[PDB]
Design a protein around this ligand. Sequence first.
Ligand SMILES: Nc1nc2c(ncn2[C@@H]2O[C@H](COP(=O)(O)OP(=O)(O)NP(=O)(O)O)[C@@H](O)[C@H]2O)c(=O)[nH]1
Ligand SMILES: Nc1nc2c(ncn2[C@@H]2O[C@H](COP(=O)(O)OP(=O)(O)NP(=O)(O)O)[C@@H](O)[C@H]2O)c(=O)[nH]1
Ligand SMILES: *CCC(=O)Nc1ccc(S(=O)(=O)N2CCC[C@H]2C(=O)OC)cc1
Ligand SMILES: *CCC(=O)Nc1ccc(S(=O)(=O)N2CCC[C@H]2C(=O)OC)cc1
Ligand SMILES: [Mg+2]
Ligand SMILES: [Mg+2]
Lengths: 203, 206
Amino acid sequence: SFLTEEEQEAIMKVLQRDAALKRAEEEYDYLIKFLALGDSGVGKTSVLYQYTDGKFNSKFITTVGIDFREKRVVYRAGRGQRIHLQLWDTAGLERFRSLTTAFFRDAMGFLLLFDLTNEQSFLNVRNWISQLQMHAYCENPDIVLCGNKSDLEDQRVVKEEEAIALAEKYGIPYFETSAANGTNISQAIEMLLDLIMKRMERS
Amino acid sequence: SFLTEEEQEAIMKVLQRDAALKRAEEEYDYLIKFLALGDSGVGKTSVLYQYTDGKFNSKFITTVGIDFREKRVVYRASATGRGQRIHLQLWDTAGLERFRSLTTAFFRDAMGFLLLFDLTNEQSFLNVRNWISQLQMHAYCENPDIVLCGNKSDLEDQRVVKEEEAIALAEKYGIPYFETSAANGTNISQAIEMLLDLIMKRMERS
Ligand SMILES: Nc1nc2c(ncn2[C@@H]2O[C@H](COP(=O)(O)OP(=O)(O)NP(=O)(O)O)[C@@H](O)[C@H]2O)c(=O)[nH]1
Ligand SMILES: Nc1nc2c(ncn2[C@@H]2O[C@H](COP(=O)(O)OP(=O)(O)NP(=O)(O)O)[C@@H](O)[C@H]2O)c(=O)[nH]1
Ligand SMILES: *CCC(=O)Nc1ccc(S(=O)(=O)N2CCC[C@H]2C(=O)OC)cc1
Ligand SMILES: *CCC(=O)Nc1ccc(S(=O)(=O)N2CCC[C@H]2C(=O)OC)cc1
Ligand SMILES: [Mg+2]
Ligand SMILES: [Mg+2]
């Protein structure tokens, strides 16, 4: 035991959903797989919820292991390309660190979140990035940096240039988001989709 | 139990090695992966160890979460046959229900399954039923190619599972059947080569 059966069958529910989804899309045109990561509480779930449903819940409900949201999107950079999105929402905790790290290998692009109001969020960005490229199934995976909780301008802590300096170092785009009001959330995600669908680089 | 934090060092050096391997397919002719599942103690790890290194260990070391052996192999099609170079990744799941999420998360990465049970353990035989439906709910394919192995055939004295009841189950599911023994290596090579045969003959008509 020491792992609720109610805790485990939820994850197997998440696991069963993903199997069906894949068996369907190899039975819209493309299927693109995003994964969100960051310290627990930086708003990974609150972001994907805000992006896919335009809703936000103030009450903290930590993500048990792994979940994903879906969303149908039309892509444009000319022509309309239709897309099903799989947005993997990893638990940010240590207890689930192995289970989340496992699904790092199913994502085409990663949204890496820190909470603007919490130094550690930012600090641990360094590690999360090199764990991203440790555990990725293609050597330069695409990452978009998200300073989340930009709506708390009254409690922000990370300097913006400090974050774009960290962003410019690794060659990664940076967005200050708020899951509360949707600021830049669509723009940051679409930008990751941009990055991904340009990686289809013919030769 | 919950995971030891040293049990999580282990599990993540494996994925380290796993991503490392996957990045070495673009950067073998075909990278073929299959996965071993079944109750704890059936011999999953021993069956792979016998196959990759012709060795065998008798003290039980239960697999911490997940591991995977590697083996390079020359696959020749079944009459005819030209040698293709297959790089095998042999996924080796733990059997304890307390890793079941983690091991189920890898049925994705698999192209085939070696479903195992213990010829000397009746309960692990009956659990197979459940293990198959788990492969039904979680394999990306479906009708995933499965090879059913009655491991531990070297212990004819301790045996409890009638051979008859086991072949029946097999053709009820239409899955090959093999009475293996990771101890003396009987059938260990022959069952795996059938999996690889079902698989490479399925990339066939992809
Ligand atoms: N003000 C504000 N609160 C936010 C924002 N995003 C999330 N929150 C709040 O902060 C908490 C953490 O958000 P949540 O999505 O649960 O974080 P998480 O990264 O998924 N945590 P975990 O990894 O444990 O599931 C919640 O109480 C949520 O309401 C935001 O942009 N602004
Ligand atoms: N005689 C005999 N013993 C075997 C055979 N296969 C495994 N065993 C023994 O029975 C035990 C099973 O070990 P193992 O191969 O790790 O089984 P497993 O299915 O991987 N167990 P787990 O899921 O817990 O890691 C060990 O003590 C091993 O020595 C076999 O074919 N013959
Ligand atoms: C740059 C490529 C990338 O970032 N991600 C990526 C990973 C995996 C896949 S996959 O669905 O084809 N896949 C590989 C092995 C099984 C499966 C998986 O990830 O297990 C869940 C596509 C893109
Ligand atoms: C039966 C289910 C299945 O085949 N899952 C699966 C997905 C991907 C891979 S893979 O790492 O080998 N891979 C990445 C690029 C090719 C692709 C592949 O194998 O062919 C689709 C393996 C297994
Ligand atoms: Mg969450
Ligand atoms: Mg084992």
